[PDB]
UniProtKB/Swiss-Prot annotation:
<feature type="binding site">
    <location>
        <position position="10"/>
    </location>
    <ligand>
        <name>Mn(2+) 2</name>
    </ligand>
</feature>
<keyword id="KW-0238">DNA-binding</keyword>
<keyword id="KW-0540">Nuclease</keyword>
<dbReference type="InterPro" id="IPR003615">
    <property type="entry name" value="HNH_nuc"/>
</dbReference>
<dbReference type="InterPro" id="IPR028629">
    <property type="entry name" value="Cas9"/>
</dbReference>
<keyword id="KW-0378">Hydrolase</keyword>
<dbReference type="GO" id="GO:0046872">
    <property type="term" value="F:metal ion binding"/>
</dbReference>
<keyword id="KW-0255">Endonuclease</keyword>
<keyword id="KW-0269">Exonuclease</keyword>
<dbReference type="Pfam" id="PF13395">
    <property type="entry name" value="HNH_4"/>
</dbReference>
<dbReference type="InterPro" id="IPR032239">
    <property type="entry name" value="Cas9-BH"/>
</dbReference>
<comment type="subunit">
    <text>Monomer. Binds crRNA and tracrRNA.</text>
</comment>
<feature type="region of interest" description="ARM">
    <location>
        <begin position="56"/>
        <end position="73"/>
    </location>
</feature>
<feature type="binding site">
    <location>
        <position position="820"/>
    </location>
    <ligand>
        <name>Mn(2+) 2</name>
    </ligand>
</feature>
<dbReference type="GO" id="GO:0003677">
    <property type="term" value="F:DNA binding"/>
</dbReference>
<dbReference type="InterPro" id="IPR055228">
    <property type="entry name" value="Cas9_RuvC"/>
</dbReference>
<dbReference type="Pfam" id="PF16593">
    <property type="entry name" value="Cas9-BH"/>
</dbReference>
Amino acid sequence: MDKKYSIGLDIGTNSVGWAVITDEYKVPSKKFKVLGNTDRHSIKKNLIGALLFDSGETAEATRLKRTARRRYTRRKNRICYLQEIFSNEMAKVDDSFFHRLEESFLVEEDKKHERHPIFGNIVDEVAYHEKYPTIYHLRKKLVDSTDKADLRLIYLALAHMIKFRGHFLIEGDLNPDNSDVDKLFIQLVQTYNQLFEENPINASGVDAKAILSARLSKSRRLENLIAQLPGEKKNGLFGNLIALSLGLTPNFKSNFDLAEDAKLQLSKDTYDDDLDNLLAQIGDQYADLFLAAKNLSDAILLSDILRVNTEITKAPLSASMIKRYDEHHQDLTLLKALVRQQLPEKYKEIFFDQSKNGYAGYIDGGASQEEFYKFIKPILEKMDGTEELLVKLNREDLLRKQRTFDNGSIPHQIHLGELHAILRRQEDFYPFLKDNREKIEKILTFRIPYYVGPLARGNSRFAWMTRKSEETITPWNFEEVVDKGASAQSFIERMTNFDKNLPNEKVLPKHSLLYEYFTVYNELTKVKYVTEGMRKPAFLSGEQKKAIVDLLFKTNRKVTVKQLKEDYFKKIECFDSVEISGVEDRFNASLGTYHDLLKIIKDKDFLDNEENEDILEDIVLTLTLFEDREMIEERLKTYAHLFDDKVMKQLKRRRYTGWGRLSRKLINGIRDKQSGKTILDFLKSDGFANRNFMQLIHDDSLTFKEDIQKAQVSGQGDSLHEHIANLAGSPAIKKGILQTVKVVDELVKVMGRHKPENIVIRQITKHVAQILDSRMNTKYDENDKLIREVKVITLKSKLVSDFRKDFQFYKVREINNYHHAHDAYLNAVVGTALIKKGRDFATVRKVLSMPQVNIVKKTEVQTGGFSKESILPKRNSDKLIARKKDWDPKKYGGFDSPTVAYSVLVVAKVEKGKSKKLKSVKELLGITIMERSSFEKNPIDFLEAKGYKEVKKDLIIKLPKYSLFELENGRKRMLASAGELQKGNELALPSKYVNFLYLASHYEKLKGSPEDNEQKQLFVEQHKHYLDEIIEQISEFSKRVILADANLDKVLSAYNKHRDKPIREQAENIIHLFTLTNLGAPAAFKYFDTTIDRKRYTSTKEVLDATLIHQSITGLYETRIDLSQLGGD
DNA sequence: CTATGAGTGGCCCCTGTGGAGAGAAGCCTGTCCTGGA
DNA sequence: GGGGCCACTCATAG
RNA sequence: CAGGACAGGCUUCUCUCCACAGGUUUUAGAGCUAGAAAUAGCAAGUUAAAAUAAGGCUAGUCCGUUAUCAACUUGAAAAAGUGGCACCGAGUCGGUGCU
């Protein structure tokens, strides 16, 4: 008799519950054969348990690190390009300068050349350090002077500029002379008054520079400026111009009464284009007004930058840096004077102690600028003469460094201008610089487009670029080697969907006109109308649909029921009264793309042309695919023969985003084999059948369904891993699902390969059920109908939670891990009971108090970073990992705290003592993650290298993390690492104590009827003696397996101390005790007033000769190996 | 007399921002359709 | 949250 | 009862590519004076170079932290295969009967 049995499953983020029950809600138990070298040949176990595992993580970190690696590599490549350019002339003056540059990081003992890099002689080095305290001094001096300087200084300046070229946000050119806010505001007002003499603006008395440079929001600046302008509004034309000058996006529809919105934003690249067409609409006389607005905006954002006001040079940033340096020097002198004058004792603290947050700590230590201000602020409060210094502190301007985090707002055009000025001044003495000025400018301004991607030769699983040729990609010949249009199309396509019914065809663009026609006819197909004299609703004819679309859909961007009734039935068909069903208020789809094309091209018959279908659809596809404008113009240049410049540029501007859910070949590509119509043709005219898309794809009359069946290529059965990975969700739930399916497979294998009756458990859960059904039921009957021998049940946790709360079967997650198993068991029981109580309740209570539950910790091989990322200074300790091959850690410091890959057991002989005496040993040597490949290649050589000799190969036992060892008195420990252990034993409590603890913990939070609440409170009051029993049992369990003498003593003392506390507080504090006894690593926990630190087992010597256990994924099959007999002499 | 292991307790760990796209999922208003029961 | 490392102290064997 | 397309909104999340600002580490930026030295006073401090997971070959202006993995037999791996049942009890499972 194949016993009828049910399987219950609970899938969480960390756990997978499993349980097997009979037809009688009873859990069978079986005796299992045990392999190994031990004597315990067979053990009886229950068929219930749960699996715990570490939660999975997303791929975000890997992608971030890859991006960082590419950034670093490309920056170094640019530096190498500059060195290559300077290579010819550098050797003619200083051959070893480049060697000195890179070899700088080595100590003086290691350097092949002289220690001073810049000159190689200390005198010139000191002279350089004196004449130019900061690199900004050199930059400004080269910008302003006309003298011929040494090649090395120019090289240094150019390298500094390139390596920190700054951000690329704003396109176009920036005028550095555009910095005066007031003068440009006056010019804008003057131009407005000249062009609007009937409405002049009196800008006198308005401080434009203060308002526009204020650290307020753009709307606040606009409001403040307008409030000072009588008669003007932010909604007015001048208000919109100011908003644009602030960097907002005003709408110019109202001031020119245009039929179309004219929205301008200076950050958008459309400013030139939209300005051009706006002038084409309102007249070209308004060019200088927008020019003045642009100049004012430029002055604004360059005024927020560049604190310097009136100093005249081509390098304002260098002037700002020098000004800050001078202020820092003067303030430092004054501060030293004052501190020495009044508080000499703290002078040492301020200027000598590195560890404190004073000036010495701010400079030579790790104290940040905010920390330094925080430390110095109370001290300055105690002294006098620091009023302006206090103001500067409030301004984040006191003693400011040059390299600060606010530098993130520097446009690259400033560095470009400085480069251009330096090259202009010095190219007369340096012909090769003048010749390669173009190359230097390109290198400074070059940027890889976002749509191109990595420049690989196919050997990267991330690269998609298509090459025109096979030259080495250089910044000067990038455009001549890469098909930018094809690359962009590939970038778009690989992220697009595939059609469900036709997986071999791309889906159409969302705003494709053919798609819009399809949708409109699809909705019109199911529109019914009832007029006077009509007994039943009738479907609209094809000519009726065509007339309706031409009259309303092509003319109105939205058509409503009332509009249709007034415009077509009442006017065209002369039906005065009509009742329309299937559309309530308005029609859903619309011909927006048709309206846009009729607005741009301004030709209706050209759009109405059926033969231009290919050209029109190709134009729509081109507008959807590409976002860069040059590529769009490149593609549109084929169709320019039919359009003027205005139409082409307006077409150049229309972008469309989104995609449809269906393919063109499905709708209008496949023709009916009988009639020749496509789906669109049938929607246009289907006779009295009037079949919609759903009806057409399911009708057996046409061959479209036959093509659907044929086009279903027999996709090779997706592997369970791949099938789950293809689902929608985070990888963690995917891992949980995979482990659950493996658990189900093992449970099936256990029961003698007899299939179960019922499997008890959002679209992801639906996919899980689908996977289970597919793997379990594969039998097809004589009619090719799947014989569902197994029932799949979907139930929500709310039902089982109610089941628990109704029958006092409380769940306390803080006691142990059995709650997952009990929840799975109750899930299965409730599902079977509902779909299919004195006996049942007794059986359930018997099941709950059962002591043996299979709890298994999943064994894993840890991977990830080689070590921590913080780099530590050199120290005399062997635990420091070198950052590179030829860098002694005691000379340079480096990494620390590597992570163990996995542990291995080694039994061999090791020399010990100064006499070099061979000693037979038995210890654990853990492999670091960085060593994993080397060890896997040849363990023998690796073990020989670490002082282990006479290798005993057959004793190598793979010991991953959480490998379980068994010791005396049932005490269990898990191998946390190569040198640390965790708790391995679980505490079991009688169910009555769990119920009492739950009732006490929610004593004041009772959610039930008043009589039930009072009864529960009385029950809590009656059984106070349980607390002593609970404490005694905890002490006994800790004594037997935990060995926590001092911590237990402190716990006992605290319990005796707080024995007078209220019952709720006592229970709440006692609940915190299980952190000492819970599975996993010990953790510190708080008990009333005293905090108890974590007791950490750092000794792996006791388990060297214990019994090792290997366990199946469900823990039913197991093999036991004793370490004592292993490695015997 | 000093090197060597074995525990107690304490302290540490890379951060911030922008631009570009595609998809998915969940909720809501609603209309229509396919399949079986 | 959780494993590594280090200062400190102590017991032990050469 | 399940499934689907559309019209619109809202919200969140995932995945991929291109850039910036730092941080950390070592070296360079003659420390002076009195004192044998311990030490005491004095001066000064803002910056620069290189590296940022060891490295690898398929040598790319590429890849290197996602995912998967109890034990034994076969297989290079993928992958395939390998373990008796019924009854009475329960402090981590125990006992009885058949085979």
